[PDB]
Structure 1
Amino acid sequence: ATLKDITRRLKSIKNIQKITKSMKMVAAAKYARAERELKPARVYGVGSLALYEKADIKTPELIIGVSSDRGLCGAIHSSVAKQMKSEAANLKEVKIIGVGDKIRSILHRTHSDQFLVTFKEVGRRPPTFGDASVIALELLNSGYEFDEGSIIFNRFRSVISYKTEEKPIFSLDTISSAESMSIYDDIDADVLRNYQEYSLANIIYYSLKESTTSEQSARMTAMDNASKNASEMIDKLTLTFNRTRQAVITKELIEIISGAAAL
């Protein structure tokens, strides 16, 4: 421990304490907006799936990861990547789509050749149905007529709690017509080709609206922890400095007096 070293770490933790403090505030505004924009978007998602739950849909014989770009949000990108790699080995042909750069980097090296499309700038600007539609367009423009898929995302619960959730997407138009669909009448083969396409854009948007609410909340959290872990570390080293300042003055003085009291 030295006066040069001590103050260097005090100079830099008073940085982190503040840098982290504003990153809590930045995320705190983005949470409060994402919490309001989720309130309707939930009802929207509720009404979107209210058909696949009321009438059972199976498949006789596509993985979508939803997170963001900006990290430091605790364990948002890492919780969905765990449940993606869980199904990457458990299954059958598996083709992956990752929304948010932090899926192209966290679970890439392992499944580098199993990529279909990648999406950036997620979590910078609050998501829209317009963003979900670009996700819907690119999926249907690719020559991958998928049998069945599942979308994995972070569902919001509260300021601190969230859970990684799967939702199966029966978006194969060949799978749209099952024995449970025989209950329904007055349908076209190519009117489901319209409905299935749109109900896909809904659930993508819903998962995206849940994610950016669950993401900014735990970044607000992680940074409120980190800024007040630095607040504690400042208050700890500062009085460690005083110890070492007073002791250096005292010790430099004994060193003189000892030399004066020998002549």
Structure 2
Amino acid sequence: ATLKDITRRLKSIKNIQKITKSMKMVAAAKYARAERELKPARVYGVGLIIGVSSDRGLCGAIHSSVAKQMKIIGVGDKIRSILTFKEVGRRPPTFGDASVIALELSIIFNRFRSVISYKTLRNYQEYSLANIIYYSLKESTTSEQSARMTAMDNASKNASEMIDKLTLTFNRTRQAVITKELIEIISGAAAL
């Protein structure tokens, strides 16, 4: 509406654009190392409700996807909050992470397809359990970082479009304000 409003809306959205862009690039880095790490883990994947995502949001429907399949153990803090293991996601998951979980004890996780897409004896049984937890975790992070990258790329491009639009609105208003003020002066002057 007013120049002051527009200026302040523009200030923040220009910030949001840069933040989401940096996030897109951090996620791109994690995903790149995650995909190259998923190859010698998928063939390894060949040999109760457990839910697998992460603590960190802003990765589209990664957390809500598995929670839909959900309704009890949750790996990823976003599972406990929407519906217990914390600090998963920020650092790439190890077999050590899979063992820590199995030691405390169907498994629901996101299977990576592409950047754009993802789909939701007593010593032998102990190993094949940890094997399942690991496979989910390695798939989980590839999907999540790909998704965060896409989400942030989308948010960044949206902000970018909003900036342009508000800038045009700004300049239309700016011109109107100058002209209006000028007409008041001339009308005041000519009436004398």
**TM-score of the pair, normalised by structure 2:** 0.97
| Alpha-carbon distance between aligned partners in 2 of 1:44 and 1:156, rounded to the nearest angstrom | 16
Question: What residue is the counterpart of 2:144 in the other structure?
Answer: 215
Consecutive unaligned residues of structure 2, counting only runs of 5 or more, are: none
Structure 1, unmatched stretches of 5+, are: 48-61, 85-94, 107-116, 139-149, 165-191
Instruction: Give the whole-Å Cα distance in 2 for the aligned partners of 1:243 and 1:46.
Output: 62
State the secondary structure of the residue aligned to 1:202.
Answer: helix
Give distance in 2, aligned partners of 1:136 and 1:3.
59
RMSD: 1.4
Q: CA deviation at 1:155?
A: 0.4
Once the two structures are TM-superposed, the CA of residue 46 in structure 1 deviates from its matched residue by 2.1
SS at match of 2:5: helix
Cα displacement string for residues 185-219 of structure 1 (whole angstroms, at most 9, x for unaligned residues): xxxxxxx1011100000110000000000001010
Q: Deviations over 1:117-160 (max 9, x none)?
A: 9100010100000000000111xxxxxxxxxxx00000000001
Partner Cα separation in structure 1 for residue 164 and residue 43 of structure 2:
47
Q: Distance in 2 between matches of 1:249 and 1:11?
A: 22
Query: Which whole-Å deviations, capped at 9, do the CAs of 1:88-119 have from their partners, x for residues lacking one?
Result: xxxxxxx901000000100xxxxxxxxxx910
Residue matched to 1:64: 50
Partner Cα separation in structure 2 for residue 31 and residue 7 of structure 1: 36
Larger Rg: 1
For 2:64 and 2:3, locate their aligned partners in 1 and report how far apart those are by CA, in whole Å. Answer: 40
* CA distances 1:17-38 after superposition (whole Å, capped 9, x unpaired): 1111111111110110110110
Scaled by the length of structure 1, the TM-score of the pair is 0.71
- Superposed CA deviations along residues 230-250 of structure 1, whole A, max 9, x for unmatched, are 000001101110111111001
Q: Which runs of 4+ in 1 moved over 4 A?
A: none
Q: Distance in 1 between matches of 2:57 and 2:169?
A: 33
How far is 1:3 from its partner?
1.1
Helix, strand or coil at the partner of 2:51: strand
Q: Secondary structure at the match of 2:110?
A: strand
* Aligned-partner SS, 1:217: helix
Give, in whole Å, the separation in 1 of the partners of 2:56 and 2:108: 18
Looking at structure 2, the residues matched to 75 and 229 of structure 1 have their Cα atoms a distance apart, in angstroms, of 18
